[PDB]
């Protein structure tokens, strides 16, 4: 019997219970956005609290973007400008008018409020 730790075990919604996403895994998610015609967008924040609905938009949603390399380059530019921020990649569906995907691509390095996968239970 392993015990799920209540200590510094914060999660950040979709994919947070999986191993950290590799560059290849992030690129595969971006291909998913493009294959489905959804609108990529980046958002960032100093802090992440469950009570806080809005983050800050990086530039504008990438309307008409069908090029995964473009999305990956904006991830680089966003994280470069805010190297200590939480940064997430999201995508919008304008037909249902809702966010249809989203996951973290960066956390602050000074953060020690979450566990590596093998330290989640004791």
């Amino acid at each position: 019997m392993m015990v799920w730790t209540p200590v510094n075990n914060k999660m950040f919604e979709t994919f947070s219970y999986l191993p950290p996403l590799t560059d290849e895994q992030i690129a595969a998610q971006v291909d998913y956005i493009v294959a489905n015609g959804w609108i990529p967008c980046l958002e960032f924040a100093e802090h992440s609290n469950p009570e806080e609905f809005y983050w800050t938009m990086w530039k504008l949603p990438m309307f008409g973007c069908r090029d995964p390399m473009q999305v990956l380059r904006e991830i680089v530019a966003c994280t470069k400008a805010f190297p200590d921020a939480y940064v997430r990649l999201v995508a919008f569906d304008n037909q249902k008018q809702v966010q249809i995907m989203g996951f973290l691509v960066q956390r602050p390095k000074t953060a020690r409020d979450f566990q590596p996968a093998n330290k989640r239970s004791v």
């Binding site: 209540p6 999660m11 950040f12 919604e13 469950p50 966010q99 989203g102 996951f103």
Partner: protein, 119 residues
């Protein structure tokens, strides 16, 4: 549509399979309080199915144990737990006692995980 006709002696069986609700009639209804898109916006949850869980045993748990089970469930990664359909208010657990303990459990699990929780 289904008030009397199913009991007519002249028929042996009757099943209503479908109804065409026309837009002019649909427009007379308030309808769902929020609906899918608004709900996801209110929960701030995107990109996957939501996860829930009925507390068990169905009946027989105290309010405090209900909240105990709820907290332990939510803290592990479920978005939701729920009362069983037949959990209303009963000698083993009165509803208001439950509501209060459940609210404590939701709050504790939300703070521990950093994710929005409900029950």
């Amino acid at each position: 549509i289904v008030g009397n006709v199913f009991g007519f002696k002249a028929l042996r069986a009757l099943r209503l399979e479908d109804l065409r609700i026309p837009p002019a009639y649909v427009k007379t209804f308030v309808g769902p309080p929020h609906g899918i898109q608004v709900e996801r916006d209110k929960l701030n949850k995107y990109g996957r199915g939501l996860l829930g869980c009925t507390i068990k045993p169905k009946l027989g748990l105290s309010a405090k144990n209900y909240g105990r089970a709820v907290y332990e469930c939510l803290r592990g990664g479920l978005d939701f737990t729920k009362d069983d359909e037949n959990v209303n208010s009963q000698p083993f657990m009165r509803w208001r006692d439950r509501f209060l303990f459940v609210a404590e459990a939701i709050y504790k699990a939300q703070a521990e995980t950093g994710e929005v929780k409900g029950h």
